[PDB]
Amino acid sequence: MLDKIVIANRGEIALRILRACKELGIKTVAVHSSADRDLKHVLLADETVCIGPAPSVKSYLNIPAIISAAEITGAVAIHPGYGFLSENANFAEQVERSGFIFIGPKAETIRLMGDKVSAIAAMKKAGVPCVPGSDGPLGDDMDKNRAIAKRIGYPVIIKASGGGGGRGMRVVRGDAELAQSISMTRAEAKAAFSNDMVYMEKYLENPRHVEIQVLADGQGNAIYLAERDCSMQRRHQKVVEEAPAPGITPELRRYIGERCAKACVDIGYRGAGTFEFLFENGEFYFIEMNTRIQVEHPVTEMITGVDLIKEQLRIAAGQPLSIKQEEVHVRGHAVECRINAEDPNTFLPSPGKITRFHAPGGFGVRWESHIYAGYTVPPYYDSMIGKLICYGENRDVAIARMKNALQELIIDGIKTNVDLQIRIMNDENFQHGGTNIHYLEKKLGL
Numbered sequence: 001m002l003d004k005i006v007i008a009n010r011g012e013i014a015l016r017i018l019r020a021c022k023e024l025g026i027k028t029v030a031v032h033s034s035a036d037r038d039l040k041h042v043l044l045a046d047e048t049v050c051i052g053p054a055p056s057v058k059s060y061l062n063i064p065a066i067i068s069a070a071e072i073t074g075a076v077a078i079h080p081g082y083g084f085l086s087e088n089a090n091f092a093e094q095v096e097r098s099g100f101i102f103i104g105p106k107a108e109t110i111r112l113m114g115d116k117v118s119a120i121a122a123m124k125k126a127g128v129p130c131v132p133g134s135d136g137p138l139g140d141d142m143d144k145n146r147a148i149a150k151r152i153g154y155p156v157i158i159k160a161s162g163g164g165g166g167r168g169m170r171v172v173r174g175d176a177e178l179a180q181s182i183s184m185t186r187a188e189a190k191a192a193f194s195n196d197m198v199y200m201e202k203y204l205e206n207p208r209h210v211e212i213q214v215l216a217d218g219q220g221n222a223i224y225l226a227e228r229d230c231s232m233q234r235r236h237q238k239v240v241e242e243a244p245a246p247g248i249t250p251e252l253r254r255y256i257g258e259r260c261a262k263a264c265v266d267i268g269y270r271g272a273g274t275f276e277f278l279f280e281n282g283e284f285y286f287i288e289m290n291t292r293i294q295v296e297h298p299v300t301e302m303i304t305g306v307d308l309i310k311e312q313l314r315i316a317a318g319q320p321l322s323i324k325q326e327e328v329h330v331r332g333h334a335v336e337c338r339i340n341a342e343d344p345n346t347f348l349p350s351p352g353k354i355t356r357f358h359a360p361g362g363f364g365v366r367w368e369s370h371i372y373a374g375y376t377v378p379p380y381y382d383s384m385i386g387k388l389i390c391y392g393e394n395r396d397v398a399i400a401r402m403k404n405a406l407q408e409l410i411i412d413g414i415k416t417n418v419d420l421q422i423r424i425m426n427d428e429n430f431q432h433g434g435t436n437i438h439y440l441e442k443k444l445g446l
């Protein structure tokens, strides 16, 4: 096993990784900004290194500082968590070039999945169903681009190859708006990604967001760990995630899961990963792959018994996956509610000092958060301060436990979305299940 690792992240995910390390007897190095000295995981870590000031550019995105911290502490690996540098192929490359293990796939694989055009080509080649599209980047010939749009059939959507997670796309409903839509998407892509490449897909009207979790080791094993429905979202920010996805049968799960695992083998995938799909009229369409462990990983852990972070670390050390595909069983149901420090009317981050804190407990209740009484949520980082995960023998029990747990949760001194989460749990359409990606924003609009 890895002797010692740098946790190149903060907040709840840093604590999550620290726990997994502690379980495996791995020494921890907590790199942190000057604003994060009193983070729970920092206080629990074996060694700590202040890598810079509050702003992320000089701390959590500071590649030299992070690598230097690994060097000086004699760490052997770096876990990037999610966000920050976790999908930064150049960082992964530098980590490996510097002689440390990057907890993720090969840098070339990160780069492939970061190039949405090339990722789709690879997935399509491997037998994964994709959205009907341009199958290549759009040029500047608008006669050709109109022909592609006609072949696909309107509405279509223009997307930046360097984008993803809702970033760098726009819907086109007729020829009249096509040229300008392509030009603007391209200009925004150039400005944001220093990559002006764009592509076209059919715009699905009312899909659900359903993603598949995979794990692949360096011994050739690749497994899928069911799916997650992430359709309950606002402006591409997930709000509630659940596993399994309501209405997905064992046969569909098998069908799409096997295709994702096969794709992993074809591309030489290593580590945890997520295949994102749109799901509509009983059909899956691949849009994007993530290579990091994600925020919503805990729902998959609850329904499979697999500790995904521990698997990442075992894989990185050269150990095979601790479980075979035949040993992966979906059992029960899990729901995750993201807890955000945000204003209820604006939805802007609402930082501040927590004056009173109480976490929920009980059977099937899992609380993932670094916060504590007297902890100050800084203004410099994301608004998500914790994750409440509830498991039950079925979806109704999971939801009932969530309702109870949300009622026990006390976070005074700052504004949170606990009340909104309670409203969602009480929503009759959510209780029925299978609401589409548009549902929450429509509910909030009314």
Ligand SMILES: Cc1c(-c2ccccc2)ccc2nc(N)nc(N)c12
Residues within 6 Å of the ligand: 131, 157, 166, 201, 202, 203, 204, 205, 206, 207, 209, 233, 236, 278, 287, 437
């Ligand atoms: C709906 C949608 C999303 C999308 C995913 C998660 C949250 C919000 C939107 C992402 C990519 C998408 N791509 C196509 N071609 N069509 C969609 N309808 C779509």
